[PDB]
């Protein structure tokens, strides 16, 4: 009722956890007649009460006394009834949870914050993030400096203006960060590896965007940015080849175009599966649950489930698969770089680089496609099964061992 841990002598089976957990269980003294689910309900209740009082300083309103009277009647009961105690606790909990839900949905603009997270942390504005990549390419090509983050944020504001985002009061709440080991006075090997995003989380959403949650959001941002960078580089190499379509095509140019097209096809199909089948599906489910519920905890759980499904189906939790996917994206970027540097016939050096990229990409795409088909066969992941189907829909990948574009340089 007051969030007050009156435990000067360590006598209560509840102890204060490390303050960011403001509360914790004293499991060693917890009476067995208090079910774990009931101790958890009490923990949630008292955490919510303490957080409400602590923020009125910075939820049951007038019913505190009513529940106190009910508890008094229970204390006046000659026998302890766990059932009646839990029923009263559950009623109080439900009232509190409904009040918090109303506060979070109406008072905290959860929909606005989720749209911001999607657009920025999740690169939901793919055209905006493309324009941002184009603006920041020069700043993020080099390792980050103490000013590289500033220049990148200026470029981001300029890109928002270019996309008529000038009216969004959110850019001043959002600041691009650069992981720079010179900021502390390992330094990021490139500005792209150093690039982060900052989101000015407003109350109460800082309750939700815990450090683990913000780390997951940063991981998602990094993954989407990596995929988009590989895609954009492959598209640029295609554009360079089309710019040279009127030039005499050389065998190396045909090989570059074929390898680039296959790498791009594979990476695009993977990205589509992850974003639409995995990421978009899980995010739509989260948003639907949140808009369908009047329980703030239910909304939180639905969002957590959305993000967990996105991370799982993106292979992020499958560390070897994630590493192989990152290697594939980097190979696609390298192929696009080779083509963009040599839109014409390759010199002996560019031709050697192109042949190395072709062979590497064919090997990695073969491994990826075989892995994806195996994953679809062992785990019914909609998005992995879609990826494997897209890879070998014509059995071209199956015949190439899964490789998109195993045709000699």
């Amino acid at each position: 009722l007051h969030g007050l841990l009156l435990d000067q002598h360590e006598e209560f089976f509840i102890k204060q956890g490390p303050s960011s957990k403001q509360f914790s269980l004293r499991v060693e003294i917890l009476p067995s007649y208090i079910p774990v689910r009931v101790a958890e309900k009490i923990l949630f209740v008292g955490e919510s009460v303490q957080m409400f009082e602590n923020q009125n300083v910075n939820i049951l309103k007038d019913q505190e006394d009513t529940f106190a009277a009910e508890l008094h009647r229970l204390k006046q009961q000659p026998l302890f009834s766990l059932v009646d105690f839990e029923q009263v606790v559950d009623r109080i909990r439900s009232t509190v949870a409904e009040h918090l839900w109303k506060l979070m949905v109406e008072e905290s603009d959860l929909l606005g914050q989720l749209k911001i997270i999607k657009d920025f942390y999740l690169l939901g504005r793919g055209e905006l993030f493309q324009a941002f990549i184009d603006t920041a390419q020069h700043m993020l090509k080099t390792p980050p400096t103490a000013v590289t983050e500033h220049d990148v944020n200026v470029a981001f504001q300029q890109s928002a203006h270019k996309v008529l985002l000038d009216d969004d009061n959110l850019l001043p709440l959002l600041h691009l960060t650069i992981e720079y080991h010179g900021k502390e006075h390992e330094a990021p090997a490139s500005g792209w590896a150093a690039l982060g995003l900052s989101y000015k989380v407003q109350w109460p959403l800082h309750i939700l965007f815990t450090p683990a949650v913000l780390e997951k959001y940063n991981v998602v941002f990094k993954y989407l940015l990596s995929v988009r960078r590989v895609q954009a580089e492959l598209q640029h190499c295609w554009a360079l080849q089309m710019q040279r379509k009127h030039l005499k095509s050389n065998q190396t140019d045909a090989v570059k175009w074929r390898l680039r097209n296959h790498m791009a096809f594979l990476v695009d199909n993977l990205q589509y599966y992850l974003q639409v089948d995995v990421l978009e599906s899980q995010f739509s489910q989260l948003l639907h649950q949140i808009n369908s519920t009047r329980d703030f905890e239910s909304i939180r759980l639905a969002h957590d489930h959305f993000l967990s499904n996105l991370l799982a189906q993106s292979f992020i939790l499958l560390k070897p698969v994630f590493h192989c996917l990152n290697e594939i994206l980097d190979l696609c970027h390298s192929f696009c770089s080779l083509v963009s540097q040599n839109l014409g016939p390759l010199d002996e050096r560019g031709a050697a680089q192109l042949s190395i990229l072709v062979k590497g990409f064919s090997r990695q795409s073969s491994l990826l496609f075989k892995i994806l088909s195996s994953v679809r066969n062992h785990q019914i992941n909609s998005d992995l099964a879609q990826l494997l189907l897209r890879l070998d829909y014509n059995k071209y990948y199956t015949q190439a061992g899964g490789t998109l574009g195993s045709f000699g340089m």
Binding site: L128, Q130, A131, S382
Partner: protein, 438 residues
Amino acid sequence: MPREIITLQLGQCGNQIGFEFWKQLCAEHGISPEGIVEEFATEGTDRKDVFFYQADDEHYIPRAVLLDLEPRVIHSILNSPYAKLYNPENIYLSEHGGGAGNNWASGFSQGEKIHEDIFDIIDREADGSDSLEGFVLCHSIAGGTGSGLGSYLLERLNDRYPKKLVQTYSVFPNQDEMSDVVVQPYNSLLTLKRLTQNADCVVVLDNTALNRIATDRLHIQNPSFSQINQLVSTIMSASTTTLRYPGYMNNDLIGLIASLIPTPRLHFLMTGYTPLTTKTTVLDVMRRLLQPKNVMVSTGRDRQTNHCYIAILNIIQGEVDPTQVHKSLQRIRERKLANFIPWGPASIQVALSRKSPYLPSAHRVSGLMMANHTSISSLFESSCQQYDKLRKREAFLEQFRKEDIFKENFDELDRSREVVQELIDEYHAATRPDYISW
């Protein structure tokens, strides 16, 4: 960094299609006919800078250059509610109000006559573009201006911006009706030649298929050119929805080209739309798109050539269940609802997009299919046959011989017929496993 695209509307048909395209874009972005953002559309998630320019006074100006060899359409645009949408300084109009007379050579001479005005407009639009990728010419291959002047503009764009894309929306005439333009096959061949040599991608808009769609699905008896241009504008809006409205996939033209055109010569694109009706599920949408009655491009269904898809992108705009999209793709694969390239894996991509919040959509979900399919070769073969039919008979050549492009010979028509034959044959090979060796 916005990536603006300049739309060049050529001749009567091109200008009318451009006007309806700008109307559709305005409706999707909530922009008034005067270029002002509607209050309900001020907070749109769409990227307007791609197709419109923003003035300092919140005026939206189309990145559109209107070129016509006939005054009727330019005057209709200047008298339309959208007259203020286009930048007047980006509009070049030939002073010789004689038009091209459905003559490719006359259209070329008109492009030459308005070259300075046209290239000044193109350069103005490029400088008014944050990341101008290239020019998109919306024209008809059968007319004079859109065909002849379109080929001239394709040549001049290829020369001036050899690193910039030259895309064409080339409206192909109805194959089942006798074209009133006896030189129409020459105009079509010249436009196909220019698309093949100086354009990266030519989207064929077959009036025969547009009429078929209007009759069977829109119940339009004798579809008018206005209705065809409205369909074109709807197609252009749905195809540009991922550029103008930030989506999750295919948000750049480079990526679009790299996904759709692995072979520069196989640049004839078929279109498909679903639903084609005057709650559409992902599976029902995909089934209708795979239905020949819902394809918006007149490609011959040659039974001799086992046409196949090189690549397919389905852009689905609106409230779409991704699980139903996945189920629809799976059902299409199992049912072989789409034929894929035999020399590569079946490339079927699906982009999810939102509908414009500013445009009223009668359909909770719409879809466009872009497919590279070898039966388009039957359309290219038809165009080549029409060119050869005119050139072998010297039909409608008296007016061409007066124009510089045809004054000495018809070699541009014969080369265009050859190019369209080669395109048809390459599309058929692309239906074949030997396409890589074709």
